[PDB]
């Protein structure tokens, strides 16, 4: 029941119609061979002579080459549509994954994301395309074989069309036995795999108590259970074939019996019997592989559903309409209070940062936890729960993301580097509207050209992954290049590494010194260089603003920052 | 090939010889039936004979029942040796995973250790057993059919016995050609999978730079490469089949030719010709499986080499012979200096840490680095590089591991809990030697009954994973119980979480208060109470002992420990 789902593949009907035309031939050939077999047995040997057996050795090879060629064209031009439908489905799937809000990507499910889409959407078309190349070749085969029986006989074909449906329902009940064994044995495999995993992870504890013996006996038990489970599934599998083989063979004995009755003879030259029986034993593969196409449509629609739940899911709520060119102003936090999904403890209780325009604030903290989740609010990676982030009199939930995100510039020491040319990694996303003179001048400005020129190709060397790359010592340096070129109005540094790289501080600190001479900048900081030059410093103790103040007028006021200053002198 | 293998499986010669005996019959059924086809055809319809035609349905049903029964037995009693050989190999593999150095389990082996060993073993058993099934059955099939052609003909059979080897070498060359395309597609397949993975590790930056435009196009190129690679593979696979079919069909036409070229031929009636041709078009499947056998052994021997590298690789270095009943005394570190494998920076530089007998020394480090790697040296989880660890005047590298570990009690949080009866945990590996009276006394001694009586059965309650699973604090309480039972002389606390102060911390301290009343004990520390009661406090800073003293006679010496006491006040 796929009505109202054809035009999803409508631009590819050429391939499918060639599949049909050159696929029904691949069964017409198989029927022609047996139909030929008849005039090669009676009319070739019984009728005393040659003049058939010089034709038919050529007709047989002709039919064979037709069969081979049709096999190739059918398989190839059905796999072409398979491929160009996998592409479209996977592309639309991916183009949906670049908007799904950050909360997901954050370790909710990323380990098997790409595999669980490519494997899944390759099993969604393998099964359906297999069902197609099965319900047509192996459905035309039946039509051809019955045609060729009737044109040669009158009775045997009738008992066969009465009798084969019995064969089919036998097929369908026995395969049902096998599937119903499969799921219970799946449940029995779950427990045994779980125990096998359980005994290991505490290896420390096994070795510390000197308890090897008990572990060996436990694995002996559970492995014998694995052996017995495999036994009970193979013992089930080995039955589903012979039973239906015997039902069909009993049909064969029946239709063989009906050749003894007096009327049936004299309608049976020594040939026609041979071709009718040949069609009987060739009909078996279509008749067995045709009444299990549900087992393929169901695999296909199962994977199709397990990815059509994914395709339309939640995305980043885009609300509001107002746009921004350059929000040269004051980002202010107001009573904001935010919670990670999947947890309970709030990360920020009532919070009141009041960033000046054109100045900088430094979020020194003893934790390393509870501060970097501000650099994930001022750019609306997440969305707050209770509060309001006023940006120039406006709320980030009212701005359109395309511009709000265009404001900030996450200059860090961990920036992911695209695997493309350097000058393309600096001017990223707008090589169209930037001129290479700007890229060169900024790469100089960021004190970055010194180690790009040494690179062999230069402004066309790949510094991304599966390329040649740049060490952690300029990853950030390129990042400053990017910020300078884009001239963002709001900066969020990380200073991720606890200390500057050897002989590399001279460039880092200098370039940053140009980078924050203007351009209001919330600088998450934990190093005594940028903090000292700060404008108003704000500490964070595990959930909340604690002790705010400029550095020079703070050390006298002991509090937290001086305490955290001493142990990091 | 493998003459040495037979005694590895010689216990199961019964199963294998039943496989062989009841498997050759399986091909004998097919050969007998094709033979029977003639007195169906010549003596059944040429003459007036109706005598054979009336028993023949019965012999057909009989031949099929023999065929089905032999199929079952030769598929069961060869998957009853496959089962036991894989089970034995697993048990001899795992019993070697309980000896490798702790550094292996550390993170070196992926959590798919179990999956890798089980899939390697299952697939080696599958490949080798399939090779046996194929070689024996199809050898019987070929021998039977060629017996068919001799007893029924004189020339066509020799034509085929000269001509089929050509078919076989065609098979080998074509399968080789497909197999090479397999790896050639495999390279770029892996490459493009990696290039697909690259994009979404840093999805953050893609949003933050507004670069969704230069992401969809990049994935368009990647997906087009994926579909083109799938196209190349499928277009390869659809040729390897329909070429050998054409070679064999050339053989078939040739056989027709020679079957009616001369007058010396034509002695074969309308019956026996059908037998010969049926035997032909049924001979192909053996002639393909038998000649691709060689590939099946390579699956099995490849995976078996993967196993046999692992099986006898390396274990924990056992040296020395000296044995200990109980090493009541004063373990001492002397100039010990240990380097983590896989790293460069030493974790412990020159150490002169002394642990007086009976007394307690407490390590208190802000780093979280360099502490919990002493509790992995006083029990030989690892082995030191430069130093000597005296234990009662002997060195740990001279004691025997089975004996030395008998004194150490890793009584911490997170202690792994076997999925067994509770009494088994608190008496692990020596329920043989220890009577339930000691368990029931110690469970009280640990003040641990509140996690026993309130449970369903208590001394029989399942509590590990796949059991009821109790609290993490309770898991620590079982660790104190288990320490109490064994009364081991050397104790190593961790004091990890410290969060359950809801009268649970009181219970913890109450239980421990007598656990370290004796038993000279190295206690990693972060709790003010246990540090206060210490006997010698030793603070480490990131690589090395810094200042050592007693809490009452240290605060006067401002040093480092007090400077940490301030922040952890």
């Amino acid at each position: 029941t796929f009505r109202r789902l054809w035009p999803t593949i409508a631009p590819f009907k050429a391939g499918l119609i060639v599949a049909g035309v050159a696929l029904i031939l691949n069964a017409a050939s198989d029927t022609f061979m047996l139909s030929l077999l008849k005039p090669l047995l009676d009319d070739g040997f019984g009728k005393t002579d040659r003049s058939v057996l010089v034709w038919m050795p050529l007709v047989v090879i002709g039919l064979m080459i037709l069969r081979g060629i049709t096999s190739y064209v059918s398989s190839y031009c059905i796999s072409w549509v398979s491929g160009k439908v996998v592409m479209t489905m996977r592309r639309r799937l991916f183009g949906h994954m670049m908007g799904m809000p950050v909360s997901f990507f954050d370790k909710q499910s990323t380990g098997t994301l790409l595999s669980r889409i490519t494997y899944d959407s390759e099993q969604v078309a393998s099964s359906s395309s297999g069902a197609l190349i099965t319900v047509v070749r192996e459905g035309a085969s039946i039509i051809g074989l019955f045609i060729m029986m009737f044109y040669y006989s009158w009775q045997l074909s009738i008992i066969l069309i009465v009798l084969a449906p019995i064969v089919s329902i036998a097929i369908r009940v026995v395969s049902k036995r096998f599937r119903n064994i499969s799921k219970n044995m799946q449940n029995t495999m779950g427990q045994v795999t779980t125990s096998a995993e359980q005994m290991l992870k505490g290896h420390k504890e096994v070795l510390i108590f000197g308890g090897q013996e008990v572990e060996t006996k436990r694995f002996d038990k559970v492995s014998n259970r694995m052996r017995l489970q495999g036994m009970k599934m193979v013992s089930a599998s080995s039955i589903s074939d012979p039973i239906i083989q015997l039902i069909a063979s009993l049909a064969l004995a029946f239709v063989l019996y009906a050749a003894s009755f007096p009327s049936v003879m004299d309608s049976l030259t020594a040939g026609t019997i041979t071709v009718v029986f040949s069609s009987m034993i060739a009909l078996m593969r279509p008749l067995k592989s045709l009444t299990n196409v549900n087992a393929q449509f169901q695999r296909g629609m199962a994977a199709c559903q397990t990815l059509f739940t994914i395709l339309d899911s939640e995305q980043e709520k885009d609300e509001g309409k107002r746009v921004i060119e350059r929000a040269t102003g004051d980002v202010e936090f107001r009573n904001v209070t935010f919670t990670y999904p999947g947890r309970d403890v709030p990360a920020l209780r009532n919070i009141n940062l009041k960033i000046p325009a054109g100045k900088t604030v430094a979020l020194v903290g003893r934790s390393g936890s509870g501060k970097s989740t501000i650099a994930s609010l001022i750019t609306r990676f997440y969305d707050i729960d209770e509060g309001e982030i006023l940006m120039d009199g406006h709320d980030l939930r009212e701005y359109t993301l395309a511009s709000l995100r265009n404001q900030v510039a996450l200059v860090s020491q961990n920036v992911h580097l695209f695997n493309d040319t350097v000058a393309n990694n600096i001017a990223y996303a707008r090589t169209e509207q930037y001129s290479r003179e700007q890229i060169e001048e900024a790469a100089r400005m960021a004190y970055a050209m010194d180690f790009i020129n040494k690179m062999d190709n230069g402004l066309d060397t790949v510094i991304g992954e599966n390329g040649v790359l740049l060490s952690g010592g300029q990853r950030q340096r390129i990042a400053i290049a990017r910020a300078l070129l884009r001239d963002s109005p709001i900066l969020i540094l990380d200073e991720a590494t606890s200390a500057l790289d050897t002989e590399s501080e001279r460039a880092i600190q200098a370039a940053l010194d140009e980078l924050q001479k203007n351009r209001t900048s919330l600088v998450i900081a934990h190093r005594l260089s940028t903090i000292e030059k700060a404008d108003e410093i704000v500490v964070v103790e595990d959930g909340v603003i604690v002790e705010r103040g400029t550095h020079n007028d703070l050390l006298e006021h002991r509090g937290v920052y001086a305490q955290l200053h001493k142990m990091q002198f | 090939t493998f003459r040495r293998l037979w005694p590895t499986i010689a216990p199961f010669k019964a199963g294998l010889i039943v496989a062989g005996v009841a498997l050759i019959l399986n091909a004998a059924s097919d050969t007998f039936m094709l033979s029977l086809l003639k007195p169906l055809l010549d003596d059944g319809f040429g003459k007036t004979d109706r005598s054979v035609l009336v028993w023949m349905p019965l012999v057909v049903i009989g031949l099929m029942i023999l065929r089905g029964i032999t199929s079952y037995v030769s598929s069961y009693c060869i998957s009853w040796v496959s089962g036991k050989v894989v089970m034995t190999m697993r048990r001899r593999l795992f019993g070697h995973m309980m000896g490798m150095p702790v550094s292996f389990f550390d993170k070196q082996s992926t959590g798919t250790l179990l999956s890798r060993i089980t899939y390697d073993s299952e697939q080696v058993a599958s490949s080798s057993s399939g090779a046996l099934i194929t070689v024996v059955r199809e050898g019987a099939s070929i021998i039977g059919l060629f017996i068919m052609m001799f007893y029924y003909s004189w020339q066509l059979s020799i034509i085929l016995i000269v001509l089929a080897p050509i078919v076989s070498i065609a098979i080998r060359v074509v399968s080789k050609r497909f197999r090479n395309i397999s790896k050639n597609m495999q390279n770029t397949m892996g490459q493009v999978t990696t290039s697909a993975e690259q994009m979404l590790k840093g999805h953050k930056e893609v949003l933050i730079f507004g670069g969704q435009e230069v992401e969809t196009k990049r994935f368009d190129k990647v997906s087009n490469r994926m579909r083109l690679q799938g196209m190349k593979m499928v277009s390869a696979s659809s040729i390897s089949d329909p070429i050998i079919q054409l070679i064999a069909s050339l053989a078939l036409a040739f056989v027709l030719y020679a079957a009616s070229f001369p007058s010396v031929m034509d002695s074969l009636t309308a019956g026996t010709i059908t037998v010969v041709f049926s035997s032909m078009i049924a001979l192909m499947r053996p002639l393909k499986s038998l000649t691709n056998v060689n590939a099946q052994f390579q699956r099995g021997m490849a995976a078996c080499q993967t196993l046999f590298t692992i099986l006898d690789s390396e274990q924990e270095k056992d040296e020395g012979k000296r044995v200990i009943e109980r090493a009541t005394g004063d373990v001492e570190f002397r100039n010990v200096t240990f380097t983590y494998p896989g790293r460069d920076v030493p974790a412990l530089r020159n150490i002169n840490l002394k642990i007086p007998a009976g007394k307690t020394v407490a390590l208190v480090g802000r780093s979280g680095s360099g502490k919990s790697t002493i509790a992995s040296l006083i029990t030989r989880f690892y082995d030191i590089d430069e130093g000597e660890i005296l234990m009662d005047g002997h060195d740990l590298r001279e004691y025997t591991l089975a004996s030395l570990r008998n004194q150490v009690a890793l009584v911490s949080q997170n202690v792994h809990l076997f999925n067994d009866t509770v009494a088994n945990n608190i008496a692990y590996a020596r329920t043989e030697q220890y009577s339930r009276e000691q368990i029931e006394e110690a469970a009280r001694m640990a003040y641990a009954m509140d996690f026993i009586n309130k449970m369903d059965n208590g001394l029989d309650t399942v509590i590990g994973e796949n059991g009821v699973l109790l609290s993490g604090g309770q898991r620590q309480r079982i660790a104190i119980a288990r320490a109490l039972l064994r009364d081991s002389p050397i104790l190593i606390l961790d004091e990890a979480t410290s969060a359950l102060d809801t009268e649970s911390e009181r219970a913890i301290q109450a239980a421990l208060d007598e656990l370290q009343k004796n038993r000279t004990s190295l206690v990693i520390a972060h709790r003010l109470s246990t540090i206060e009661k210490a006997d010698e406090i030793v603070v480490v800073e990131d690589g090395v002992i810094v200042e050592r003293g007693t809490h009452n006679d240290l605060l006067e010496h401002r040093g480092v420990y007090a400077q940490l006491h301030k922040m952890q006040f």
Partner: nanobody
Amino acid sequence: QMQLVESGGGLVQAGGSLRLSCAVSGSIFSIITLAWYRQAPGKPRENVATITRGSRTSYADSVKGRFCISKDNAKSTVYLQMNKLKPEDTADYYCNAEGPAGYWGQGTPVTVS
């Protein structure tokens, strides 16, 4: 918006003892830094004592081991006790919170005989 209320005494004898309280409202009181500042008629503001999230304490060089500070968990009110008063310490005393560039109270002058 966090708010605070300052309570204090007035003129007292020299070398005596006094206790000062400061109420805090609309706050996460249990963690924020709290302190006291004094401002001379001629000299600017200056801190005297400071508390921290860990019940830590600190004092200036001028007054060391002379005054004592504490916080009340239930009442959300701090206490600062001054002992061995000095006439030269007669100035304007202020309650403060959340560091120096944070928030300030009304201020109650104290006179020493």
